[PDB]
Design a protein around this ligand. Structure first.
Ligand SMILES: [Mg+2]
Ligand SMILES: [Mg+2]
Length: 170
RNA sequence: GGGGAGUUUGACUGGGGCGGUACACCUGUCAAACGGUAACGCAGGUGUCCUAAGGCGAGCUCAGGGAGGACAGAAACCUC
């Protein structure tokens, strides 16, 4: 048997692009990201100052956004279609989440505009389960127990069964 | 305008002088489980800075570590 609603569902999908310098490149990356995600993304300032990468304290160097639900699985479907539903054993974290990256963006269904240029990005997905909001709600916060959490094997099974993908070793 | 006049040229202090400030303040210890308690005892700090680094209210949680993610690495950004 099974519990009808202890099943696995994706609860958020995070997209980010880290360009490493503020300016026209940054705002065009924000533009392509918001065109892809249908909503305005946000800028993240540099935490520290390191001159090896040519960055300083508190300038926007990356643009990221998060999605839930319908648009989340559509974007994830596009990304996995680009990655031909192929992932590696080490692509999955110990907490049940996973992710990957796309070297360039116009392949997943984005028209090439010569002005904006080309940009890669990182997809990440946080596998969830009904009741995970306990860990972050305000009134009576608590843990999510031991049985209810997600492990690497469960994430692998969910990925290979729902999206009929292949986990090549590596 | 030392030609001439009057006067002054601190204190502390293992003699005085040179050095130093133990000369006004602050922290720990000395200090002997109330408080107080000495030495040129020990380790140090002060003559500032702030329109917010003051005053309320709201919302968040930090250092670090582990596991993941294109360039990305020991270190850039995202997630748990
Ligand atoms: Mg005389
Ligand atoms: Mg006594």
């Amino acid at each position: 048997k099974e519990n009808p609603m202890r099943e696995l569902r994706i609860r958020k999908l995070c997209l980010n692009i880290c360009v490493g310098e503020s300016g026209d490149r940054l705002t065009r990356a924000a533009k392509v990201l918001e065109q892809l995600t249908g909503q305005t993304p946000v800028f993240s300032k540099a935490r520290y100052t390191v001159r090896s990468f040519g960055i300083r304290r508190n300038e926007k160097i990356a643009v990221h956004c998060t999605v839930r639900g319908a648009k989340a699985e559509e974007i994830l479907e596009k990304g996995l279609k680009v990655r031909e539903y192929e992932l590696r054993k080490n692509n999955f974290s110990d907490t049940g989440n996973f992710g990957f990256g796309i070297q360039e963006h116009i392949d997943l269904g984005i028209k090439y505009d010569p002005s904006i240029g080309i940009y890669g990005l990182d997809f990440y997905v946080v596998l969830g389960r009904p009741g995970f909001s306990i860990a972050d709600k305000k009134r009576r916060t608590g843990c999510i127990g031991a049985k209810h959490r997600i492990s690497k094997e469960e994430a692998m099974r969910w990925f290979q069964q729902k999206y009929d993908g292949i986990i090549l070793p590596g």
